[PDB]
Structure 1
Amino acid sequence: MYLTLQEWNARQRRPRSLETVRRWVRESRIFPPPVKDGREYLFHESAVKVDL
């Protein structure tokens, strides 16, 4: 299922500050790009961080 930004962060090898994760999203570092459902990002469970 979709994860919240904090829930996706908590499953990564090195969780970061939520502001950091948000910056990754703004910078197109997350594949697939999270959808903003209303006020919050939804991450695919299989979303990964990529180097651009």
Structure 2
Amino acid sequence: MYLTLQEWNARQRRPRSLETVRRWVRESRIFPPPVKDGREYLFHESAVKVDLNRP
């Protein structure tokens, strides 16, 4: 009952391109990382874009 990358970003009120998110994951800005299903990426409902250090 989670959400795929597409919808995963549809929840943010200020998202961007998909490949743009791929950079975020590279910088480890999101967590927990997506499931590298060989080639796809499942964004568990636990995935979220972090800011810096002030939750």
Superposition deviation, residue 42 in structure 1: 0.8
Q: Kindly, what percent of the aligned residue pairs are identical?
A: 100
Equivalenced residues, count: 52
Please say which structure displays the higher CA radius of gyration: 2
State the TM-score, normalized to the length of structure 2: 0.74
- TM-score, normalising length: structure 1: 0.77
C-alpha distance in 2 between matches for 1:34 and 1:2: 11
Q: Which structure shows the higher strand fraction? A: 1
Structure 1: which 5+ runs fail to align?
Answer: none
Report the aligned-residue RMSD. 1.5
- The ranges of structure 1 where at least 4 consecutive aligned residues each deviate by more than 2 angstroms after the TM superposition are none
